[PDB]
Amino acid sequence: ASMILELDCGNSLIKWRVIEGAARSVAGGLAESDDALVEQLTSQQALPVRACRLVSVRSEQETSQLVARLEQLFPVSALVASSGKQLAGVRNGYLDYQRLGLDRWLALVAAHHLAKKACLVIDLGTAVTSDLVAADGVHLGGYICPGMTLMRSQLRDAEARRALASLQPGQATAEAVERGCLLMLRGFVREQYAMACELLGPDCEIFLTGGDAELVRDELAGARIMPDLVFVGLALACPIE
Amino acid sequence: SMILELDCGNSLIKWRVIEGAARSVAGGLAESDDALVEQLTSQQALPVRACRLVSVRSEQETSQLVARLEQLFPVSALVASSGKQLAGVRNGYLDYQRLGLDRWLALVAAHHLAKKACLVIDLGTAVTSDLVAADGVHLGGYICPGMTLMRSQLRTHTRRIRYDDAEARRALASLQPGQATAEAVERGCLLMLRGFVREQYAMACELLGPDCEIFLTGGDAELVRDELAGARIMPDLVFVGLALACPI
Fold first, then answer.
1. Are residues B4 and B111 located together in one domain of the fold?
2. Lower CB density within 10 Å: C or N end of chain B?
3. Cα(first)–Cα(last) distance of chain A, in Å?
């Protein structure tokens, strides 16, 4: 049969996966550079990839280049997600709908599509984003702030996890920074939940995504953790056969 | 005769001149060793006959600043140094010398003034928070980015984040969901900042008791003080500690 290669092209990373059928992932990875990406994908050209869809927050030129390299590695005609005032019953909340990062857009649309209720959508990645959508599908807007990665490379994995074994006051540089930043991130999440309760109601659905979701999930007992949220939205934005 | 006081941070150099025990009559933020020596020129007259300072810079850069000072004033400059104890306060870092000297003097000043357990947060380019038990024992602290650093990080992360100061200030008039880049970024970062402060307050109530005194310093203290009505805002906290570290 034919499989689909999906990609999320962020500012500093490219996440990809190949799915069989509707959404069963059989392979995927994270590339810190296009060369790393080509390197990883080259090992999967054995897979019957015959379709491709992706979302990108990079320049129109940078994306076309990537698309070109993709269409070289696989016999496909890549679909590229684009800005919209509406998608799957969800209304873009930006003054200028095109100003909304496409990654945030697809994820928040995916969330409302799945919940059909008001929801809080938080992406804990390199950068952190939070978006709120009313029960009627209207996007209220959102927020942006740095993630653990950006906060780190500014003031400075198994060893860092050790510094994070406690959130009590640090007695050494490494501890102060790691615990400081995580408490700042955890603080942000609580501010988002409070804001959502106020504008969406206490029973709103909560969606967490991004590689650092695990660091804050304990704060919201009922939150739904979905590493591939954006990809759910990408299927809606670029439907295939 | 007056005293010239300086706080040499990694970037800016906050200074002031005081008459008597601590009455400030002049001061300012010098973003560079140059925007200082000359900055002590503009509004000038003040007859300083003593000087003390704390610095978190290389022992090189230190005398590099002390240099153009030992010449501008007939004073034998006093420099604050690390310590395991000061004015009844115990340094809480495993290696007492790794603790930022500015943080150190500010938290010591706080306990010196309260004589109770305290939470001390400095809302500057970078944000720091330290806790001190009622017996004067520093439990340690936290370090994280402040507003300017968070903006800087995001700016560097993506070219899609760029706007005017005017648009930036406009954005902070509300904390509701942003509907434009400046609104999402400015409100996001401020909520993260306000969020960090609430976590610190919770951590303090836990380890120090709900009775602990709260001290806020740094230029961005105003952005978060409403969260702690009882908070004591002290822009010059570090200088209270400098006098304890270098008495005159």
1. yes
2. N
3. 13
User: Does A2 share its domain with A102?
Assistant: yes
Nearest Cα residue in chain A from B131: A169
- Could you tell me how far CA B76 lies from the centroid of its own chain? 25
Here the tokens at position A240 are 């295939």
- Find tokens 């991130």 and name the residue: A185
Give the method of determination. X-ray
Q: CA A233, CA A235: separation in Å to the nearest integer?
A: 5
- Same domain, yes or no: B16 and B30: yes
Q: Which residues of B touch A184 (CB under 8 A)?
A: 127, 144-145, 192-193, 195-196, 199
In A, which residues are within 8 Å of B92 by CB distance?
169, 171
Q: Does residue B109 share a domain with residue B145?
A: no
Q: DSSP letter at A214?
A: G
Q: Is the dihedral of CA B190, B171, A192, B229 positive or negative?
A: positive
Distance from CA of B158 to the nearest CA of A (A): 6
Closest partner residue to A146 (CB to CB) among B143, B150, B160 is: B150
Q: What is the CATH number of the domain that holds A34?
A: 3.30.420.40
Other beta carbons within 10 angstroms of residue A112's beta carbon come to: 28
**Number of domains, chain A:** 2
Quick one: B51 and B136 in the same domain? Answer: no
In this structure, are B63 and B43 located in the same domain? yes
Number of residues that this document lists for chain A: 241
Q: Are residues B149 and B93 in the same domain?
A: no
Active site residue B236: no
Q: What is the largest CA-CA distance in chain A?
A: 58
Nearest Cα of chain B lies from the Cα of A153 at a distance, in angstroms, of 9
Q: A-chain residues within 8 Å CB-CB of B126?
A: 155
Phi/psi region, residue B88 (left: phi>0; alpha: psi -120 to 50; beta: rest), is left
Residues B136 and B57 in one domain: no
DSSP-assigned states of every residue in chain B: -EEEEEEE-SS-EEEEEEETTTEEEEEEEESSSHHHHTTTTSS----EEEEEEEE-S-HHHHHHHHHHHHTTSS---EE----SEETTEE--SSSGGGS-HHHHHHHHHHHHHHSS-EEEEEESSEEEEEEE-TTSBEEEEEEEE-HHHHHHHHHHH-TT----HHHHHHHTT--SPBSSHHHHHHHHHHHHHHHHHHHHHHHHHHHT-TT-EEEEESTTGGGTGGGGTT-EE-TTHHHHHHHHHS--
**Is the Cβ pair B142, A170 closer than 8 Å?**
yes
CA-based nearest distance B70→chain A, Å: 33
- B187 marked as part of a ligand binding site: no
Catalytic (active-site) positions of A:
103
